[PDB]
Write a protein that binds this ligand. Sequence first.
Ligand code: ADP
Ligand code: MG
Length: 504
Amino acid sequence: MSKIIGIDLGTTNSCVAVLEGGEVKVIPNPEGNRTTPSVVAFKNGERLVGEVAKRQAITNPNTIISIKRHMGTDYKVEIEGKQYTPQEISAIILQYLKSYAEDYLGEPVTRAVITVPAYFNDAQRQATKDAGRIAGLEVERIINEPTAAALAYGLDKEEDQTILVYDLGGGTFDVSILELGDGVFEVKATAGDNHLGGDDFDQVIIDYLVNQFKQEHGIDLSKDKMALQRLKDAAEKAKKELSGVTQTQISLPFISANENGPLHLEMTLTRAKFEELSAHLVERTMGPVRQALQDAGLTPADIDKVILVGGSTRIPAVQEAIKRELGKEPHKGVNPDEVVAIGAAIQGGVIAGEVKDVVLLDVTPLSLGIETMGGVFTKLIERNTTIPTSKSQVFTTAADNQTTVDIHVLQGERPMAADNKSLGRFQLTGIPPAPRGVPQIEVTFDIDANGIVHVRAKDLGTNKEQSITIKSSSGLSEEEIQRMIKEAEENAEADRKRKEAAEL
Ligand SMILES: Nc1ncnc2c1ncn2[C@@H]1O[C@H](COP(=O)(O)OP(=O)(O)O)[C@@H](O)[C@H]1O
Ligand SMILES: [Mg+2]
């Protein structure tokens, strides 16, 4: 039966993870990348999704970007006179992800756990549950992104605590305060900016570039789709490189043309210059963090953990800003581009891991024991004990100078030996003379997996032993077993038999 893939169906990107072995694995798509653009293009009647669709987003007029902003709305996109709902376009993305998860698994995947923003309403959720179904997936669970991220860090396996997840994606900014209470998360606060994301950090670069070009050649590249698409792609690639390097080259040869021929755009962009251009974007990120603290009635001190989610969280200036705002070192331990999908796959594994199957197990049908001074039944192995089993009890002599002890093995539930079934008898002889209660005879009952019991009596000081395989015709089976099992609680109370404190 199918696995439950974890799906992060994001505004800019989507990611799918699955639990295989005992580890969560992020599934690479057809071209080897772990995240695929959440965009669909209808070029020539063929539905394109992923990078191939994003590569022509500026160039192609019917290309659908961030359709997630629509979900749960009666919005309609029209391509060549045909209307599609957000559920339908979300389904296409959905179908892609499911497909490549099947390639990777080498088997059909028909179940999933889909992730959504903590603030999605019923309409919004339902729209993504419906998208899953259109795509052919049984949506086992709709969990929210902040929680999925917490799951990826295994926070639900820890002590009660307050968590702040700072989520900066390609198009939106979300901050959620989660309070873990006895392994269960609760969203205390939510705040954000649904128009603050990596795309905007992109937009600063693109603007700086076309302006230098506007003042150096009097040409506005933002008016040429082909030039713009080249700019968009290059502005994003440069932003990313600036996350691990302080200097980078934006090289756009044959970008345009004038009276004298081809024009080339070449220029080195430093981290410092990029940070300068986007400093306002980084500050717009602080308000939602404070409003969320206010709503929860908290202060940076009440937050035990800050978690980072979103690819834009990789930006050095962004990490330094929340580090300074909260006074805590952010957790980036798990890939911020995959953290949500990873938490969804853990939940999927948990759902898929539920077993309700029963296993047969042999247990002792009645209490087993030995007769003890005064006609009382002394049990060694209680009723309903799992076999194989082995129990040992040390017994002693009743009178001064015993030589011998009679081991009478019984099976039943009542206190006096006379009311139980006799299973066998043997005796240990040659016990060195000693005062009463001084010699130590260890009797051990050993039951093998087939229910046969073997009794041994061993003089611990001498090491001489005797034993027998108490043994079937072994006596009781069907009725007799239940007849005695009732009758013992029934006639209860010659448990008066504590009259047997025939004392000493
Ligand atoms: N190394 C990086 N440095 C800065 N930004 C990055 C890096 N890698 C990806 N990003 C940005 O992360 C954003 C995508 O965020 P992500 O969490 O993948 O998306 P979504 O909003 O769909 O959930 C994009 O704007 C991308 O350019
Ligand atoms: Mg996201």
